[PDB]
Amino acid sequence: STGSATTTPIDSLDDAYITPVQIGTPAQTLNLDFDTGSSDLWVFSSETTASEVDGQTIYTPSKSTTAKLLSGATWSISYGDGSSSSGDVYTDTVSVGGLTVTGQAVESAKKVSSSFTEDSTIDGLLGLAFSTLNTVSPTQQKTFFDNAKASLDSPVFTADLGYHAPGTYNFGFIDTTAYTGSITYTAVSTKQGFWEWTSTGYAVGSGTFKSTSIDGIADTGTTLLYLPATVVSAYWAQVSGAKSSSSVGGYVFPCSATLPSFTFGVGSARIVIPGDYIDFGPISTGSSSCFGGIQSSAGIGINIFGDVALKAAFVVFNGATTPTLGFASK
Ligand SMILES: CCCc1nccc(N)n1
């Protein structure tokens, strides 16, 4: 089998991407944030505290003839941005882009933190990291990808995120029309439950490439590119008037600037992030200070290749017995 679904930015800045997902019988379509940095499929629901729902579409398990309570199971998650959610668990039929999994764990939120409430466009998360990170207790549950894998034509999914435009998540096949040149594959460590890999280095604009190992994660659920402070300082030093602001919480730059590109290494290959991808717009409405898309990881404990980086590539998440990542230009 295969599946193919369009992913759409939630706003003019590409803060996140939503993909429609069919849950239950008859189908209930929710728009989920596909997240290769976490491993829970959780939804706004008929169980969510009413004051914490503000415009999201909810899953109502009592209206699904295939929903079953997973007795005794609970979940609770906290994300790198400090957001959180928790609840109980159903199994139900879940389809993405024509690919169906029966008996998927659908984690129903009883509580969500204010960032989730305040974002009417995201109805929940669909985790695509390794199932070892799944938070369901006392019986850990499998991701949608892990449940689909055996049925797929090839044990892979691909992320093709757009810049200010829709893109695609494919399951079970590699669309050879979706990228230019060849796909460079690189080793993955699953030891922390992430798609963790080592970039071979970077360049700033037309500058010379610096060969240096940068360990980090391929994370579709993170907006920005978080790298070591040395690398980030080298980038922003090329932008007149850029500075790190403790009050704003990162590097800011004059909105009048033209940003340089940023290149990262994948083996001997190179992915170029255009400068425009690094502009996250005014820090507050009408400000002439703009927020940068490349920020320091120093306060995180891991480097994160988030959407700023991944949207410059066609990315293969190879779930073979020994997982690997692939990157192509597009
Ligand atoms: C705007 C980024 C997407 C998002 N929305 C709500 C909560 C969260 N952690 N991320």
Instruction: Please report the resolution in angstroms.
Output: 1.2
Check if 225 has its Cβ closer than 6 Å to any atom of ligand 1. Answer: no
Alpha-carbon distance 196 to 10, whole Å? 26
**Is the fold of 5-174 the same as that of 175-330?**
yes
Check if 34 has its Cβ closer than 6 Å to any atom of ligand 1. Answer: no
* 289 CB-near residues (< 8 Å, 6+ apart): 245, 248, 252, 253, 254, 255, 282, 283
Compute CA distances 196 → 130, 230, 321, whole Å. Answer: 11, 20, 16
Helices within 68-139 (DSSP H only) = 114-118
| DSSP code, position 61 | G
Helices within the chain (DSSP H only) = 114-118, 144-148, 229-236, 307-310
Q: Is 4 a catalytic residue?
A: no
**Residues 156, 162, 165, 169: what is their CA dihedral angle, to the nearest 10 degrees?**
10
Q: Would you give the distance in Å from CA 183 to the centre of its chain?
A: 20
Cis, bond preceding 254 (omega within 30 deg of 0): no
* 63 CB-near residues (< 8 Å, 6+ apart): 24, 28
Q: Would you give the distance in Å from CA 231 to the centre of its chain?
A: 22
Ligand 1 geometric centre to CA of 119 (Å): 7
* 23 CB-near residues (< 8 Å, 6+ apart): 29, 30, 43, 59, 64, 92, 93, 94, 106
Burial 91-124 (b: 16+ CB within 10 A, else e): bbbbbbbebebeebbbbbbbebbeebbebebbbb
Check if 66 has its Cβ closer than 6 Å to any atom of ligand 1. Answer: no
Compute CA distances 36 → 49, 134, 327, whole Å. Answer: 27, 12, 15
* Encoded tokens for 123: 């109805």
Residue 115's identity, in one-letter code, is S
Alpha-carbon distance 302 to 119, whole Å? 26
The CATH homologous superfamily to which domain 175-330 belongs is: Acid Proteases (2.40.70.10)
Check if 112 has its Cβ closer than 6 Å to any atom of ligand 1. Answer: no
Q: Which residue's alpha carbon is nearest to atom 1 within ligand 1?
A: 15
Check if 16 has its Cβ closer than 6 Å to any atom of ligand 1. Answer: yes
Check if 54 has its Cβ closer than 6 Å to any atom of ligand 1. Answer: no
Q: Which residue's alpha carbon is nearest to atom 9 within ligand 1?
A: 83
In sequence order, what are the beta bridge partners of 318?
156, 324
* 7 CB-near residues (< 8 Å, 6+ apart): 17, 18, 19, 34, 159, 161, 162, 166, 167, 168, 169
Q: Is 119 a catalytic residue?
A: no
In sequence order, what are the beta bridge partners of 31?
20
* 130 CB-near residues (< 8 Å, 6+ apart): 39, 143, 146, 190, 193, 194
Kindly report the CATH number that applies to the domain delimited by 5-174.
2.40.70.10
Residue 114's identity, in one-letter code, is S
**Is there a contact between 279 and 262 (Cβ–Cβ < 8 Å)?**
no
Alpha-carbon distance 24 to 228, whole Å? 43
SS3 63: helix
**Is there a contact between 80 and 222 (Cβ–Cβ < 8 Å)?**
yes
Atom of ligand 1 nearest to the CA of 33: 3
- Please tell me which residue in 14, 35, 119, 123 is annotated as part of the active site: 35
Question: What was the experiment behind these coordinates?
Answer: X-ray
In sequence order, what are the beta bridge partners of 298?
none
Mutate to test the pocket of ligand 1, among 10, 79, 116 (most ligand atoms within 8 A of CB): 116
**Spatial CA neighbour of 315 closest among 201, 170, 190, 135:** 170
Q: Which residue's alpha carbon is nearest to atom 6 within ligand 1?
A: 116
Max CA distance (Å), the chain? 60
Check if 15 has its Cβ closer than 6 Å to any atom of ligand 1. Answer: yes
Compute CA distances 314 → 175, 220, 271, whole Å. Answer: 10, 12, 10
Check if 52 has its Cβ closer than 6 Å to any atom of ligand 1. Answer: no
**Residue the block writes with tokens 């009592």:** 62
Atom of ligand 1 nearest to the CA of 11: 1
Alpha-carbon distance 161 to 307, whole Å? 8
**Is there a contact between 214 and 303 (Cβ–Cβ < 8 Å)?**
yes
* 79 CB-near residues (< 8 Å, 6+ apart): 38, 221
Ligand 1 geometric centre to CA of 56 (Å): 13
Q: Which residue's alpha carbon is nearest to atom 3 within ligand 1?
A: 16
Alpha-carbon distance 301 to 159, whole Å? 25
Alpha-carbon distance 272 to 210, whole Å? 14
- Please tell me which residue in 39, 45, 199, 297 is annotated as part of the active site: 199
Query: What residue spans define the domains of the chain?
Result: 5-174, 175-330
